[PDB]
Design a protein around this motif. Structure first.
Motif, short mmCIF file in Angstrom:
data_model
loop_
_atom_site.label_atom_id
_atom_site.label_comp_id
_atom_site.label_asym_id
_atom_site.label_seq_id
_atom_site.Cartn_x
_atom_site.Cartn_y
_atom_site.Cartn_z
N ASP A 1 35.12 45.09 24.71
CA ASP A 1 34.58 44.01 25.53
C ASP A 1 34.46 44.37 27.00
O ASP A 1 33.80 43.65 27.75
CB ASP A 1 35.45 42.76 25.38
N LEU A 2 35.09 45.47 27.44
CA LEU A 2 35.07 45.86 28.84
C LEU A 2 34.31 47.15 29.10
O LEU A 2 34.06 47.48 30.26
CB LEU A 2 36.52 45.99 29.35
N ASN A 3 33.90 47.86 28.05
CA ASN A 3 33.14 49.11 28.17
C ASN A 3 33.90 50.15 28.98
O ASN A 3 33.35 50.81 29.86
CB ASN A 3 31.75 48.84 28.78
N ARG B 1 35.45 46.12 41.21
CA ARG B 1 36.27 45.61 40.12
C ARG B 1 37.69 46.13 40.25
O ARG B 1 37.91 47.30 40.58
CB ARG B 1 35.70 46.01 38.75
N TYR C 1 41.64 42.42 34.09
CA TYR C 1 40.65 42.78 35.08
C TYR C 1 40.15 41.56 35.84
O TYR C 1 40.22 40.42 35.35
CB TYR C 1 39.46 43.51 34.44
#
Ligand SMILES: *[C@@H]1O[C@H](CO)[C@@H](O)[C@H](O)[C@H]1NC(C)=O
Ligand SMILES: *[C@@H]1O[C@H](CO)[C@@H](O)[C@H](O)[C@H]1NC(C)=O
Ligand SMILES: *[C@@H]1O[C@H](CO)[C@@H](O)[C@H](O)[C@H]1NC(C)=O
Ligand SMILES: [Ca+2]
Lengths: 49, 481, 480
Positions: free
Chosen positions: C155-157, C102, C174
Motif C-alpha cells: 500500500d506504500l510502494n 514524506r 508514515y
C-alpha cells in the motif's frame, strides 16, 4: 605577557602552601646588549634573527 | 690504449680549465654591490617620520607621495664632504650615484569602461577602471597636453622586450618623462604638478628604472621595476637586480681573466678536427643515437657561452660612452635581457660540465657498471611505463566515474590522478571512499593496492636486476682469455 | 589481417569514451556539495553547535526537524547578504519543491524479547532489535489518521534500504507533509506533542526532491536516522542528482546517435562471438582474451537494458510538474541510475584493459607480455597462501580488537585496516591501549612477517620468471 604568566602560575608554584620542594630561590638573570632593537619592517615575515 | 689515455687526460684538463674559467666568471666584488643595490637602492624610507617599506604602499595619495620622496632622495648622492659640492657629489661605489643623467619613468593608464554595468544598477557603477590589459589599451594622458610627460603614444620610447608573466607582455602606452639636474627640477618640483593626480582612477602601472654609475669598468649597470597600481590604491612592485660592469682587464692582476678561454675554445677546434672525420669516414650514421647521448652536444656545449661573451664584450663596448649630459638617456632594453640570458647559459653549461665530469669520474669499475646497466635497459624500462600508465589511467577513469560525484578528492580527472599518486605514497584516506560506495569502493582500493604495488613495483626491480646482473656477467666473462 | 579488427576496436573505444564523457556532464558535484552543506552543516539552532552529522539524542533529532530542516528546505535562496547585483556562487539553490516531503518511521512492539524472570520484578518493557518478524503492526496514541496506523509495503510502494545496522523494510507509520512552511511546522509540532518517537522506534526516513529550476537536473534527498536497541542515534544521508530531460539542444541529440552506434557495435560483437564459438574450437575458453570479450558483451547488454528501463520509466516523472499535492516516488530512478553508473564504470575499465592484446608487436612488449603471462600460475598459488595468512591475522584482530577500536569492528573492516597497515596508515595509539598485551605482539609480528618474508617472496617469483623468460627468448634466437 610574561608578567601575567609569572604572577598567575609561577609565583604560586614556587611558594605554594606545603608543596613544591624548591631547594633554592629562583633567579631572573637577563642580558642587556645596550642597544635599542629595531622593530621588524613589514614584509614576508622573515624567519631570521 | 696509450693514445686513448692521453686523449682522455687532455680532455679532462680542458674540462678543468673550462670549469676554472666559468668559476672565475663568477668572481667576487659583486655580491656586496648587488646587496647594496637591492637593499638600499630603490628600497629605503622616504624620511625618518615613516615606517613603510619601498613596496608597502596601501593608499593612492600616500603611494604617490612616497614615490615622489624616494625619487627626490635617490636622484642625488649623499653629502660626502670631499669636493666643491657642485651637484650631488658622489664618493662611493655602493648604489649611491644611481641616477645616470635624465631619468625616464612611465605610467601606463588603465582603461575605463571595459563592459557595461547591470541595467538595474543605475548611478552605482559608472566609472570602472579596468585591470591593466594590452588588448584594450587606451591612450589616456593628462588633459594639459604640454611636453613629453603629457602624451600617450606607442612604445617607441619604452624599450621593452617582453614580459610573458602574470597577465601579458609589458605595454609601452604611457607618458615618458625626463629628469632635469639634481637641484634644477629634481629636488623641489616633483609635486609641483599636483593638479593632475598621478595616483587617480586612471592609471594602471608605473614603470621606473635605475642605473648604477658607480662602477669602475664603464659603470654599465641598470635595473628596472614595475609597480602595478591596485584598484583600491597603493602599488605592488616587481623587479630584479642587474648589477654589472664592463669587461676591462688590467694585466697587473687580471692578465689571464679570459685569455685562456680562447685557448679553451681552441680545444673545441680540436674537437672540430674529429668532427668531420668520425662521421664521414668511419661509423657513418651509426654512433649518433645509441652512443652519442653526450658526444654530439659536447662540441656545442661551450659554443653558447663563447658566443654570448663575444656579443657582450666586443659588440656592446663601442656604445658604452654613456654620455648623458642631461640630454641623452639610453634605456636597458637589451642589456638586462642579454645579462639574464648569459647568466642562464653559463649556469646551464656549468651544470652540463659537472654532469660530464661526474660521468668522466666513472673511471672506476662500479660507476661504469652502474652507467652501463641503466643504458642497456632504457628501451625495456620505457616500454614498461606504457603498461603502467595504461593501468593507472584505467583505474583513474574507474575512480572518476564511481566516486566523482560525492568525494572531493575525485571531483575532476587531475584530482583523481593526484589522489591515486598520493595513495601510492602512503596517503590513503578511505574514510569518505568507503562510505561513498559500500560495495565497489573497497574493491577498487584493495585491487589497486594489490595489483599496482606488488605486480608493477616488482616488474620494475625485476627489469633492473636482470640488466644489472647481465652487465656484471658480461664484464666478468671478459677475464682470462 | 588484424588491422581491420584494430580499427573496429579503436572505433568502439572512441564511441564508448565520448559517450561516457557526454554522460558525465559537469557541476553535478558542486550541486551535491551545496546540498550537503545546506542540509548537514548548519546548526539546528543558533544556541547550539550540533548539526545533523553529529546527532546524539532523540531531542536533537526533534530540534533538527523544526530547525535546520525547515530553515533550508523552503526557499533558503534569500540574498540578504552582500550579493554582487546577482546571486553569488554559493546561492544558486532556489530549489522549487516537487510537491510534499514524506516522513516515515519503523518501530517494534513491546514484548519482542523475553526478559529473565530473575530481573522480571525490576524490568517490564523489552524491545528487541529490528526484525521483520518482531515489527509492530498496531495503532497507538491518538489513533485517528495515517501517522498512527500501520500500512503495508504494498500500500506504500516501499522497498528495502540496507541501512547501517539492519535492512529496513518498506512499511511503517508514515505522514505526508504540506507545501508551506507555517503548516508543515504546525504538523511537526503536533506530532511532537503527542509523543511519536517512543522507546520502540527503530528507524526514521525523510524523503523529498527538488529541481533547482535553472541547471535542469532533479535531486532526490533521503535522510535516515536509526536508533539502536542500546540507546543512541545513527544518522545517514543520500543525495542523488538526476538528469532525465535529455532533449533541449543539438548536443544531446548526438548522444542518441552514439547509443545507436553502440548498439550496432554490441550486436556485431555478439554475432561474431556466437559464430566463432560454434564452428571454431567449441569450448575455446582456454585463453584470456577469449574469456574477456564475453564479460564486456554481458556488461554492455546489462547496461543498455538498464538504460532502456530508465528511458521507459522517464515518462512516470514528467506528468506531474505543475501538480504539488502528492509525494513523488523517485527512489527507483536513483537506484537504477547508481546501478547504471557502476556498470558503465566497470565496462569502461574492462574495455581499457582489453587494449593490451594489440600492443604486442615489437620484441620488448612481446617479451614483457610473455614474462607477465608466465608468472601467473605461481603468483596465484602464492597469493592463496598469502591470503590464508592474511585472513588468519584478520580474524585474530577481529576477535581481539572487535569491540573498542572501530577499525576492527567488522571482518571486512579488519581486512581493509590491515591493507592500510601495509601502507603505514596505522594509528597504534588505540591498538596498544585496547589490549596492552597481545596487541603490540599482533602489530610487530604482522609487520615483520608480512613485509620481509611475503614481499621478498612476491618479488623473487617475478624476478626469477623474468630471468628465465629472457634467457629462453635469447636462446631460441641465433640458434636456428
Ligand atoms: C509490555 O508488556 C508487558 C507484558 O506483560 C507488560 O507487563 C508491560 O506493562 C508492557 N509495557 C508497556 C509500556 O506496554
Ligand atoms: C485526529 O483526527 C484528525 C485526523 O484524522 C485530526 O484533525 C484531529 O485533530 C486529531 N485529534 C487529535 C486529538 O489529535
Ligand atoms: C502507491 O502507488 C499507487 C499506485 O496507484 C498509488 O495509488 C498510491 O497512492 C501510492 N502510495 C502512496 C502512499 O502514495
Ligand atoms: Ca574474440
Amino acid at each position: 605577557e610574561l608578567w601575567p604568566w609569572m604572577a598567575h602560575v609561577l609565583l604560586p608554584y614556587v611558594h605554594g602552601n606545603q608543596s613544591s620542594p624548591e631547594l633554592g630561590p629562583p633567579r631572573l638573570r637577563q642580558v642587556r646588549l645596550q642597544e635599542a632593537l629595531y622593530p621588524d619592517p613589514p614584509g614576508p615575515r622573515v624567519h631570521t634573527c | 690504449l696509450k693514445s686513448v689515455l692521453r686523449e682522455l687526460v687532455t680532455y679532462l684538463l680542458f674540462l678543468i680549465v673550462l670549469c676554472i674559467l666559468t668559476y672565475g666568471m663568477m668572481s667576487s666584488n659583486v655580491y656586496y654591490y648587488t646587496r647594496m643595490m637591492s637593499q638600499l637602492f630603490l628600497d629605503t624610507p622616504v624620511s625618518k617620520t615613516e615606517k613603510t617599506n619601498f613596496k608597502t604602499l596601501s593608499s593612492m595619495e600616500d603611494f604617490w607621495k612616497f614615490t615622489e620622496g624616494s625619487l627626490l632622495d635617490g636622484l642625488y648622492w649623499k653629502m660626502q664632504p670631499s669636493n666643491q659640492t657642485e651637484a650631488d657629489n658622489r664618493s662611493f661605489i655602493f648604489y649611491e650615484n644611481l641616477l645616470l643623467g635624465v631619468p625616464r619613468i612611465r605610467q601606463l593608464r588603465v582603461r575605463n569602461g571595459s563592459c557595461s554595468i547591470p541595467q538595474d544598477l543605475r548611478d552605482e557603477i559608472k566609472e570602472c577602471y579596468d585591470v591593466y590589459s594590452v588588448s584594450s589599451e587606451d591612450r589616456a594622458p593628462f588633459g594639459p597636453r604640454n611636453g613629453t610627460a603629457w602624451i600617450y603614444t606607442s612604445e617607441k620610447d619604452l624599450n621593452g622586450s617582453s614580459h610573458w608573466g602574470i597577465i601579458a607582455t609589458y605595454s609601452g602606452a604611457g607618458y615618458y618623462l625626463d629628469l632635469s639636474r639634481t637641484r634644477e627640477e629634481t629636488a623641489a618640483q616633483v609635486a609641483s604638478l599636483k593638479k593632475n593626480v598621478w595616483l587617480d582612477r586612471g592609471t594602471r602601472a608605473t614603470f621606473i628604472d635605475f642605473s648604477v654609475y658607480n662602477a669602475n669598468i664603464n659603470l654599465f649597470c641598470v635595473v628596472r621595476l614595475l609597480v602595478e597600481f591596485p584598484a583600491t590604491g597603493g602599488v605592488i612592485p616587481s623587479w630584479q637586480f642587474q648589477p654589472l660592469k664592463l669587461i676591462r682587464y688590467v694585466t697587473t692582476f687580471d692578465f689571464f681573466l679570459a685569455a685562456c678561454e680562447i685557448i679553451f675554445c681552441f680545444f673545441i677546434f680540436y674537437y672540430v678536427v674529429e668532427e668531420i672525420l668520425e662521421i664521414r669516414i668511419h661509423k657513418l650514421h651509426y654512433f649518433r643515437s645509441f652512443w652519442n647521448c653526450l658526444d654530439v652536444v659536447i662540441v656545442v656545449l661551450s659554443v653558447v657561452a663563447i658566443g654570448i661573451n663575444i656579443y657582450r664584450t666586443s659588440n656592446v663596448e663601442v656604445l658604452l660612452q654613456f654620455l648623458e649630459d642631461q640630454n641623452t638617456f639610453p634605456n636597458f632594453e637589451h642589456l638586462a635581457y642579454w645579462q639574464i640570458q648569459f647568466n642562464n647559459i653559463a649556469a646551464v653549461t656549468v651544470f652540463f660540465v659537472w654532469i660530464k665530469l661526474f660521468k668522466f669520474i666513472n673511471f672506476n669499475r662500479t660507476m661504469s657498471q652502474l652507467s652501463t646497466t641503466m643504458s642497456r635497459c632504457a628501451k625495456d624500462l620505457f616500454g614498461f611505463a606504457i603498461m603502467f600508465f595504461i593501468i593507472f589511467l584505467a583505474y583513474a577513469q574507474l575512480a572518476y566515474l564511481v566516486f566523482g560525484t560525492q568525494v572531493d578528492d575525485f571531483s575532476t580527472f587531475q584530482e583523481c590522478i593526484f589522489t591515486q599518486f598520493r595513495i601510492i605514497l602512503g596517503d590513503i584516506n578511505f574514510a569518505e571512499i568507503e562510505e561513498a560506495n559500500r560495495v565497489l569502493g573497497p574493491i577498487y582500493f584493495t585491487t589497486f593496492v594489490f595489483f599496482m604495488f606488488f605486480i608493477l613495483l616488482n616488474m620494475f626491480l625485476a627489469i633492473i636486476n636482470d640488466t644489472y646482473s647481465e652487465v656484471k656477467s658480461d664484464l666478468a666473462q671478459q677475464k682470462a682469455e
